[PDB]
Amino acid sequence: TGDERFYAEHLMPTLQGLLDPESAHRLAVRFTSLGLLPRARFQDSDMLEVRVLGHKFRNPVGIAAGFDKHGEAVDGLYKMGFGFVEIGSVTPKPQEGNPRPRVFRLPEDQAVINRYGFNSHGLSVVEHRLRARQQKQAKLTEDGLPLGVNLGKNKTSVDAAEDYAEGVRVLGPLADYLVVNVSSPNTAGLRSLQGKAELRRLLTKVLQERDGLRRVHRPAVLVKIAPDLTSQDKEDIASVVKELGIDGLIVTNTTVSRPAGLQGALRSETGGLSGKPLRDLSTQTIREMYALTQGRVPIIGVGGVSSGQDALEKIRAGASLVQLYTALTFWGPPVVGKVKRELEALLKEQGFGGVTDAIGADHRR
Ligand SMILES: Cc1cc2nc3c(=O)[nH]c(=O)nc-3n(C[C@H](O)[C@H](O)[C@H](O)COP(=O)(O)O)c2cc1C
Ligand SMILES: O=C1N=C(Nc2ccccc2C(=O)O)[SH]=C1Cc1cccc2ccccc12
Ligand SMILES: O=C(O)c1cc(=O)[nH]c(=O)[nH]1
């Protein structure tokens, strides 16, 4: 198709030449919130449908947290072709996040490093924003386009579980699924909430708040993990997830590692790395988690997805759904239809009736 080619080779390099990464993002969000796109040529086939988390997903490719941090562009993003949308991370109180610059292109690596630090309009602003389209969203969800909301904690917060509980109370009622994000590389001690005893205390509490909501307003709760966990960390997470009945896992966040081979000038910037260099690392974490959970805990695979093959590798490794974020910054919106079209072809090629059949297929070889 001519869009994929026009954006990849002309529009995108020209936007990159003109704007810094954060400016580029601010604008993409604005353009997307307003409707300014084509609307995806691509009609979703029934092959691409998945039932998971107590919902239907028209297609398994979503937009990952971080792009629409404050719930400003949700509708524009469904229009862009994504089959689900996740917003956030959202913190209880507004906060500016880290000082600029805080995001960086590694174009030689097809990667991004960012250290935003949970810049957020805060719960209550985001709450009103979602309330304003609540019903539009109830019909979207009924149609197979669900909404997830990803929760973070304030920098100066003295009680991390309490931040998350507040989150659950305020935005849980407006979400199909909530994410407890304990894997940001950009908030002091946040990733240590991933340790057992701390993870169990926090999630017990989150799940309690969640169960306290009214049934129609009661979201699934997932936990988003780093790709940088030790074997122990992973065993422990798996365990706690089974012990508490956590609804799913998102795998993975960005990596604080710096794989050998990175060429980008800015490769030594502090921050989490996303995009291609993260891909196989995150696919392997999906693999280890699926196995440790016996395939009974849905996983949203995320990290370096940019093609149907990328996606399908994550699905075969155990992901029920996948998300991308960095690919959109290199290739623009056509990447979304590109991934779907290829995923569909690949599924036919390997004799899968649909996505559901491919989920975990590698573990059954
Ligand atoms: C600029 C930027 C901001 C991000 N912000 C968030 C965030 O607030 N919360 C979160 O859970 N993940 C965040 N992520 C991580 C993405 O959700 C995703 O896990 C990661 O980038 C891997 O996917 P990708 O390689 O498709 O970008 C962010 C990523 C980038 C690149
Ligand atoms: O999602 C996008 N992100 C872009 N840049 C970024 C966003 C977040 C972090 C880093 C960047 C970056 O460019 O480094 S550019 C873009 C999407 C896009 C590009 C070109 C035209 C568009 C028109 C409408 C919506 C998105 C568009
Ligand atoms: O806000 C950020 O800096 C951020 C959060 C997160 O979860 N992941 C990430 O890569 N950056």
Side-chain angles (χ1 to χ4, degrees), residues 60-79:
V61 180
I63 174 72
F67 177 71
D68 192 11
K69 279 171 175 293
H70 330 281
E72 288 161 306
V74 171
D75 291 301
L77 288 163
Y78 292 124
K79 193 189 174 194

mmCIF file of all heavy atoms in Angstrom, residues 60-79:
data_model
loop_
_atom_site.group_PDB
_atom_site.id
_atom_site.type_symbol
_atom_site.label_atom_id
_atom_site.label_comp_id
_atom_site.label_asym_id
_atom_site.label_seq_id
_atom_site.Cartn_x
_atom_site.Cartn_y
_atom_site.Cartn_z
ATOM 1 N N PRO A 60 -6.342 -8.019 17.910
ATOM 2 C CA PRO A 60 -5.534 -8.161 19.081
ATOM 3 C C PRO A 60 -4.395 -7.150 19.200
ATOM 4 O O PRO A 60 -3.490 -7.314 20.050
ATOM 5 C CB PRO A 60 -4.954 -9.548 18.897
ATOM 6 C CG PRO A 60 -4.687 -9.578 17.442
ATOM 7 C CD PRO A 60 -5.750 -8.718 16.786
ATOM 8 N N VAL A 61 -4.426 -6.101 18.399
ATOM 9 C CA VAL A 61 -3.330 -5.147 18.371
ATOM 10 C C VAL A 61 -3.829 -3.881 19.019
ATOM 11 O O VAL A 61 -4.732 -3.254 18.496
ATOM 12 C CB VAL A 61 -2.921 -4.901 16.923
ATOM 13 C CG1 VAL A 61 -1.771 -3.919 16.810
ATOM 14 C CG2 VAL A 61 -2.581 -6.235 16.294
ATOM 15 N N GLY A 62 -3.271 -3.533 20.168
ATOM 16 C CA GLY A 62 -3.626 -2.332 20.859
ATOM 17 C C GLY A 62 -2.471 -1.347 20.897
ATOM 18 O O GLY A 62 -1.363 -1.629 20.508
ATOM 19 N N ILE A 63 -2.770 -0.159 21.367
ATOM 20 C CA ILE A 63 -1.787 0.871 21.613
ATOM 21 C C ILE A 63 -1.414 0.787 23.091
ATOM 22 O O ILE A 63 -2.263 0.667 23.974
ATOM 23 C CB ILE A 63 -2.312 2.277 21.244
ATOM 24 C CG1 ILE A 63 -1.316 3.377 21.656
ATOM 25 C CG2 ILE A 63 -3.639 2.571 21.932
ATOM 26 C CD1 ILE A 63 -0.073 3.454 20.819
ATOM 27 N N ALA A 64 -0.119 0.811 23.338
ATOM 28 C CA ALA A 64 0.391 0.635 24.666
ATOM 29 C C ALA A 64 0.303 1.939 25.480
ATOM 30 O O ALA A 64 0.163 3.028 24.941
ATOM 31 C CB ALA A 64 1.827 0.144 24.596
ATOM 32 N N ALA A 65 0.398 1.802 26.787
ATOM 33 C CA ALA A 65 0.378 2.945 27.638
ATOM 34 C C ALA A 65 1.542 3.834 27.306
ATOM 35 O O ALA A 65 2.594 3.373 26.914
ATOM 36 C CB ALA A 65 0.428 2.530 29.099
ATOM 37 N N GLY A 66 1.331 5.133 27.469
ATOM 38 C CA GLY A 66 2.394 6.092 27.279
ATOM 39 C C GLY A 66 2.123 7.007 26.123
ATOM 40 O O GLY A 66 2.605 8.140 26.117
ATOM 41 N N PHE A 67 1.375 6.540 25.143
ATOM 42 C CA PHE A 67 1.139 7.372 24.013
ATOM 43 C C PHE A 67 0.084 8.358 24.437
ATOM 44 O O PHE A 67 0.315 9.551 24.401
ATOM 45 C CB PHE A 67 0.690 6.615 22.747
ATOM 46 C CG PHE A 67 0.380 7.523 21.603
ATOM 47 C CD1 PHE A 67 1.390 8.189 20.947
ATOM 48 C CD2 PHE A 67 -0.925 7.792 21.238
ATOM 49 C CE1 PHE A 67 1.091 9.081 19.915
ATOM 50 C CE2 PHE A 67 -1.235 8.662 20.194
ATOM 51 C CZ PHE A 67 -0.222 9.296 19.533
ATOM 52 N N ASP A 68 -1.075 7.857 24.851
ATOM 53 C CA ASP A 68 -2.143 8.721 25.338
ATOM 54 C C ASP A 68 -2.178 8.700 26.862
ATOM 55 O O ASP A 68 -3.033 8.047 27.461
ATOM 56 C CB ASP A 68 -3.492 8.278 24.772
ATOM 57 C CG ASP A 68 -4.588 9.299 25.012
ATOM 58 O OD1 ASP A 68 -4.267 10.430 25.433
ATOM 59 O OD2 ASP A 68 -5.770 8.969 24.779
ATOM 60 N N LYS A 69 -1.244 9.411 27.486
ATOM 61 C CA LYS A 69 -1.142 9.408 28.914
ATOM 62 C C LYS A 69 -2.406 9.953 29.635
ATOM 63 O O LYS A 69 -2.699 9.517 30.758
ATOM 64 C CB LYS A 69 0.129 10.152 29.363
ATOM 65 C CG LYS A 69 1.382 9.322 29.271
ATOM 66 C CD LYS A 69 2.628 10.161 29.504
ATOM 67 C CE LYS A 69 3.930 9.332 29.544
ATOM 68 N NZ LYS A 69 4.115 8.376 30.687
ATOM 69 N N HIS A 70 -3.145 10.881 29.027
ATOM 70 C CA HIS A 70 -4.224 11.530 29.776
ATOM 71 C C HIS A 70 -5.623 11.295 29.198
ATOM 72 O O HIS A 70 -6.530 12.071 29.479
ATOM 73 C CB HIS A 70 -3.976 13.033 29.916
ATOM 74 C CG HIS A 70 -2.526 13.414 29.945
ATOM 75 N ND1 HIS A 70 -1.743 13.288 31.071
ATOM 76 C CD2 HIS A 70 -1.722 13.944 28.990
ATOM 77 C CE1 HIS A 70 -0.513 13.693 30.800
ATOM 78 N NE2 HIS A 70 -0.474 14.102 29.543
ATOM 79 N N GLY A 71 -5.810 10.263 28.384
ATOM 80 C CA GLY A 71 -7.130 9.990 27.810
ATOM 81 C C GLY A 71 -7.704 11.048 26.906
ATOM 82 O O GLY A 71 -8.875 11.288 26.898
ATOM 83 N N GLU A 72 -6.864 11.674 26.123
ATOM 84 C CA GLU A 72 -7.265 12.720 25.187
ATOM 85 C C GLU A 72 -7.561 12.254 23.778
ATOM 86 O O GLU A 72 -8.127 13.019 23.035
ATOM 87 C CB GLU A 72 -6.129 13.742 25.070
ATOM 88 C CG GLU A 72 -5.996 14.600 26.301
ATOM 89 C CD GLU A 72 -4.651 15.277 26.395
ATOM 90 O OE1 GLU A 72 -3.609 14.577 26.335
ATOM 91 O OE2 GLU A 72 -4.635 16.511 26.586
ATOM 92 N N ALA A 73 -7.125 11.057 23.372
ATOM 93 C CA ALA A 73 -7.115 10.670 21.941
ATOM 94 C C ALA A 73 -7.708 9.295 21.736
ATOM 95 O O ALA A 73 -7.517 8.648 20.714
ATOM 96 C CB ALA A 73 -5.711 10.739 21.389
ATOM 97 N N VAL A 74 -8.514 8.857 22.675
ATOM 98 C CA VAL A 74 -8.941 7.460 22.644
ATOM 99 C C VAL A 74 -9.678 7.118 21.368
ATOM 100 O O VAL A 74 -9.417 6.093 20.745
ATOM 101 C CB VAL A 74 -9.865 7.095 23.817
ATOM 102 C CG1 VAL A 74 -10.423 5.724 23.586
ATOM 103 C CG2 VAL A 74 -9.122 7.146 25.127
ATOM 104 N N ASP A 75 -10.632 7.965 21.026
ATOM 105 C CA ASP A 75 -11.476 7.761 19.857
ATOM 106 C C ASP A 75 -10.660 7.810 18.581
ATOM 107 O O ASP A 75 -10.847 6.990 17.706
ATOM 108 C CB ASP A 75 -12.608 8.797 19.830
ATOM 109 C CG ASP A 75 -13.586 8.558 20.909
ATOM 110 O OD1 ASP A 75 -14.192 7.456 20.956
ATOM 111 O OD2 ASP A 75 -13.723 9.439 21.774
ATOM 112 N N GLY A 76 -9.738 8.743 18.512
ATOM 113 C CA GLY A 76 -8.842 8.831 17.368
ATOM 114 C C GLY A 76 -8.008 7.588 17.151
ATOM 115 O O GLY A 76 -7.710 7.199 16.027
ATOM 116 N N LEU A 77 -7.636 6.966 18.265
ATOM 117 C CA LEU A 77 -6.891 5.726 18.258
ATOM 118 C C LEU A 77 -7.709 4.532 17.859
ATOM 119 O O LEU A 77 -7.257 3.732 17.093
ATOM 120 C CB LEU A 77 -6.297 5.514 19.628
ATOM 121 C CG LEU A 77 -5.133 6.448 19.955
ATOM 122 C CD1 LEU A 77 -4.896 6.464 21.431
ATOM 123 C CD2 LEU A 77 -3.850 5.987 19.325
ATOM 124 N N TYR A 78 -8.918 4.377 18.333
ATOM 125 C CA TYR A 78 -9.768 3.312 17.704
ATOM 126 C C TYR A 78 -9.919 3.485 16.204
ATOM 127 O O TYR A 78 -9.894 2.548 15.446
ATOM 128 C CB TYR A 78 -11.149 3.257 18.297
ATOM 129 C CG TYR A 78 -11.183 2.803 19.688
ATOM 130 C CD1 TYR A 78 -11.770 3.572 20.672
ATOM 131 C CD2 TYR A 78 -10.626 1.619 20.036
ATOM 132 C CE1 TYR A 78 -11.801 3.140 22.013
ATOM 133 C CE2 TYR A 78 -10.639 1.180 21.359
ATOM 134 C CZ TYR A 78 -11.214 1.930 22.348
ATOM 135 O OH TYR A 78 -11.228 1.430 23.635
ATOM 136 N N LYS A 79 -9.971 4.725 15.791
ATOM 137 C CA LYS A 79 -10.128 5.066 14.404
ATOM 138 C C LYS A 79 -8.901 4.718 13.660
ATOM 139 O O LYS A 79 -8.945 4.457 12.487
ATOM 140 C CB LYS A 79 -10.358 6.573 14.261
ATOM 141 C CG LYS A 79 -10.847 6.986 12.906
ATOM 142 C CD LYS A 79 -10.833 8.477 12.766
ATOM 143 C CE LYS A 79 -11.194 8.812 11.320
ATOM 144 N NZ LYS A 79 -10.898 10.229 10.982
#
